[PDB]
Design a protein around this nucleic acid. Sequence first.
RNA 1: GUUAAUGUAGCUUAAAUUAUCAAAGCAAGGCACUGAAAAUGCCUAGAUGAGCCUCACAGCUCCAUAAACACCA
RNA 2: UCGGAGUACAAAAAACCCUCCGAGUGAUUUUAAUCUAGACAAACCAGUCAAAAUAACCAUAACAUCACUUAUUGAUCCAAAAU
Lengths: 125, 165, 354, 52
Amino acid sequence: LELLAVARKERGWGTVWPSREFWHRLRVIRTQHHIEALVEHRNGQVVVSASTREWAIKKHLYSTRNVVACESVGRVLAERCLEAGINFMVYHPTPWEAASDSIKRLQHAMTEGGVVLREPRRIYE
Amino acid sequence: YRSKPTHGIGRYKHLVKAQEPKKKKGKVEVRPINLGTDYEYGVLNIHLIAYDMALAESYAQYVHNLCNHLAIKVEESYAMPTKTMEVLQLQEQGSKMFLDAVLTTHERVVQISGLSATFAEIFLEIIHSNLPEGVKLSVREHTEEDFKGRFKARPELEELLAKLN
Amino acid sequence: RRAAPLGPMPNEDIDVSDLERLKKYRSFDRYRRRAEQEARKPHWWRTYREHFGEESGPKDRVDIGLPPPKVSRTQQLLERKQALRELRANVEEERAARLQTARIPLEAVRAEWERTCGPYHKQRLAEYCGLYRDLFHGATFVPRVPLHVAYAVGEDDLMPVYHGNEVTPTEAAQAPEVTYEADEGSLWTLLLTNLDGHLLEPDAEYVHWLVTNIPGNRVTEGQETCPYLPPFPARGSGFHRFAFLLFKQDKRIDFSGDTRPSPCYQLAQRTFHTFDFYKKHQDAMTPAGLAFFQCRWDDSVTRVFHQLLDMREPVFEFVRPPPYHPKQKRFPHRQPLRYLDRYRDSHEPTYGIY
Amino acid sequence: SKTILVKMMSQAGTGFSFNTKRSRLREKLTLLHYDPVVKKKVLFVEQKKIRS
RNA sequence: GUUAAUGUAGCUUAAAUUAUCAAAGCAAGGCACUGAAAAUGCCUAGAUGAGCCUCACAGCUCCAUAAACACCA
RNA sequence: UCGGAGUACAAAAAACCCUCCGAGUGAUUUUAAUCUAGACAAACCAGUCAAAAUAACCAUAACAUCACUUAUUGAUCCAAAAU
Ligand SMILES: [K+]
Ligand SMILES: [Mg+2]
Ligand SMILES: [Mg+2]
Ligand SMILES: [Mg+2]
Ligand SMILES: [Mg+2]
């Protein structure tokens, strides 16, 4: 149903944030030491995750808390999402994070990585 | 609901302070000056006076930041109005003066709250030891007279005050 | 009539008095992190997770798979740090990192991701898609050994099959090739099944490929049981999931009771139950790998029903429930003129005695 | 201070008029409304004064 | 020397070749940003006390911290 | 006549020539469309919300905002204006 764009989106809330009307949500957490990016279903489970805490990515990056580190996280997650078949997701950034240099270029990697934001509208919503 | 065990789960007004809004008619700096506790000194003003604006403010920031790390409440970090003095030197082989230079004074004040009597020795020890160069530290009591310098002058009252006397 | 709470209140730990002493949040990104950590705890009151299908909450998952490889943390901790110091000291790396001009060998990360944390990431992918629910019910396995499935489409083009990918049936018309690292000291079993797509029974799955007693890497040399059949999803109901299962077996097992005829085209003979199948040979086989892809309908499916299966192609359609209307009152009150149109049976006028 | 009610006619040629409350001291008003007749946004200008 | 307490980074998680993907989170700093703080952006530094035992549970011991009998003007 | 708080302590309703505050409109531009499931409210007349669908424009864009925002208002007939 999710791939056919006929499944139910959890419309509502509005008085809280972020809006939970999605099939997949991109969750980017910037701790002072590591960068972690998560793709979550509306059930709370995490499907595909790419973080600098992994030893696979740690040994190829200079530091885990740079602007370049966010790019590597974005590119690695973009490849994994294509491998996992997830092509659409919703990203709701904090307004100050939307103007941040790292997040701005992180989405650029996602767009060129093949993963497209702005999930398709539900059919007969 | 009242009878439910989950009553009062949304209580929050007791977490934040009342935060009395600055009313247009009631706008006033009502400061309950505390004086002479068992081990807590009164409100103190750390007057930092220096000739250079950059040097005076740089040490002013250090005092304010040091208090936060030491859990010392800082009520305000205002700045006393500056004073400008015209430096006139005497001319040799003569008596008439000449304009030598224009030197100004910059004062930064970091008002602090009460502190434990034991901590008074320790806190002031760090301050006076770190006076960079020529900074005139002055830790005086927060009397209203010391706070009157921040305001303006009112000759309209002085016209009435002189005639009242 | 005030009642007593059944447990600790949320904000009763902090002291109401002496507010200034308590340090504040001062930020909005700290509260979100704190709120989300609080939202996942099992509170005694009614929560969103309780009513909206948390899948029975905590579940005692049964593990049926190869044990994890034995790795010494003490040695691994030192070597990982030692390798990082060599990269850290490189000045030219600092030159690129500061100037925001650097890239990474994604292919190298792909190879290492498979070896280190690939099995664990693939486990939750299967759980999300419910592969374990429809194959081993509550039981789950960790895909310890890497597995690669690829389809030959063109002269040299190679369509890969990753976990949860999407493959058109045209690419899957021919049999794929499977590559995995294994020594010539054991046997392997490969199984391709169509989890959804069975017509008569909704709880059964078809079998499209089954190779038994594979000597090491060479899949072709292994004994063949069920021949390959191209996927045939229905035109209406799309996105069927096809899963590749790799089993590691200790001894040569007699997989003759599940033998299928050579030009097997009777779908009634393709009926399969993985849980029932794994029940018989639970002692010998052990799941080790996994790779599954989605598949929808295309033109190449039609010839499968006609030429191969000798079947009339069935076409489905997504049908929504009819709209709900209230019981019709004799005298509708303050209702629009279109109130009668809702309960009309047909728009063709029907005359009676006239 | 009293406001004035003026009728605005579409500049797209179609006959479409909607009234708008306007301050008296303000000059002639010109807005960007949306007439369903053309199904496109078109310029609207003040034409007549009806009610004060 | 001897008698009694303790020793992952500032607190604290996982860990402690007990197994696992892994030494984590928050603090603490520099710079920029109306003047102070605070936010925000960019960005810096890092420990599994030590050895042994167990190698498939983790603790003893050593050393050190630190108090004591106790050298002291 | 219309709204808010108490009387009316916890779903709704609830009176007095009862106790206290207000409204009979301004400011601004984001000038706010058409069509229809289902409901709240109610003696009646009135009042309120509203998914989907269509058009408008980031080319898969509908809550005008602020002032305790809640009240800022008037039925037929009849008259005047382009209809
Ligand atoms: K099916
Ligand atoms: Mg600052
Ligand atoms: Mg009713
Ligand atoms: Mg709509
Ligand atoms: Mg009449």
